[PDB]
């Protein structure tokens, strides 16, 4: 678990998040290593809409063992600001994360910061409708990472949905 002296940075929230995109199968195409360790490699999730929320069934390989987690996600306050409550089971755990960037079509970048040792740990992940980022979505992703008051594009690990077992 990697810690960075100081409080979590202040983050500019998105203003156009669209909950309607999240159904079907989304692939976790990249993440920070602390996230891949904690919540697994080879990650993907099937989202099922249920009113103003989504049911999440998420597959990953965690400490070398396959797991399914059953979980939910919900908006927190105005849905457009991309503040997202999620639960995942287990042992059910819950929390809140925020959306750093999306094109409301192909990809979403999620972020969680967590601050008493003098510091914070950041977790970043990227989901996409396609197993691999190609082009348009990839370009969008490429640019957002640079002006990030918080994402270190060098620290991301891109998934390889190949070997995975």
Cα 113 off chain centre by:
12
Could you give the CA distance from residue 51 to residue 118 in angstroms, rounded to a whole number? 41
**Structural domain harbouring 48:** 1-165
Q: Look at residue 99 and give its three-state secondary structure.
A: strand
The residues near 164 (Cβ < 8 Å, ≥ 6 apart) are 41, 42, 61
DSSP summary character for residue 9: P
Strands 4-5 and 24-31: unpaired
What are the DSSP calls for 20-75, one per residue?
A: GG--EEEEEEEE-HHHHHHH-EEEEEEEEE-SSSEEEEEEEEETTEEEEEEEEEEE
Strands 93-102 and 107-114: antiparallel
How many domains does the chain contain in total?
Answer: 1
Looking from the CA of 160 toward its CB, the CA atoms found within 13 Å total 5
Which of 115, 150, 125 has the alpha carbon at shortest distance from 33? 125
Q: Please provide the size of the chain in residues.
A: 165
Are residues 28 and 142 in contact, defined by beta-carbon separation less than 8 angstroms? no
CB atoms within 10 A of CB 64: 8
CATH number at residue 115: 2.40.128.20
Q: Quick one: resolution in A?
A: 1.8
Q: Look at residue 80 and give its three-state secondary structure.
A: helix
Experimental method: X-ray
Cα–Cα distances in angstroms (integers) from residue 145 to residues 5, 86, 106, 154, in the given order: 21, 24, 16, 10
Which of 37, 28, 27, 39 has the alpha carbon at shortest distance from 93? 39
Could you give the CA distance from residue 8 to residue 59 in angstroms, rounded to a whole number? 29
Residue with tokens 């960037």: 101
Helix (H), strand (E) at residue 133: none
């Amino acid at each position: 678990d990697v810690y960075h002296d100081g409080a979590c940075p202040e983050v500019k929230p998105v203003d156009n998040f669209d909950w309607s995109q999240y159904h079907g199968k989304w692939w976790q195409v990249a993440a920070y290593p602390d996230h891949i360790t904690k919540y697994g490699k080879c990650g993907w999730a099937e989202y099922t809409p249920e009113g103003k929320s989504v049911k999440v069934s998420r597959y990953s390989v965690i400490h070398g063992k396959e797991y399914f987690s059953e979980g939910t996600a919900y908006p927190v306050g105005d849905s457009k600001i991309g503040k997202i409550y999620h639960s995942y089971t287990g042992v059910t755990q819950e929390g809140v994360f925020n959306v750093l960037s999306t094109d409301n079509k192909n990809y979403i970048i999620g972020y969680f910061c967590s601050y008493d040792k003098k510091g914070h740990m950041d977790l970043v992940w990227v989901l996409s409708r396609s197993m691999v980022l190609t082009g348009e979505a990839k370009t969008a992703v490429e640019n957002y990472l640079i002006g990030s008051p918080v994402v270190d594009s060098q620290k991301l690990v891109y998934s390889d949905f190949s070997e995975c077992k």
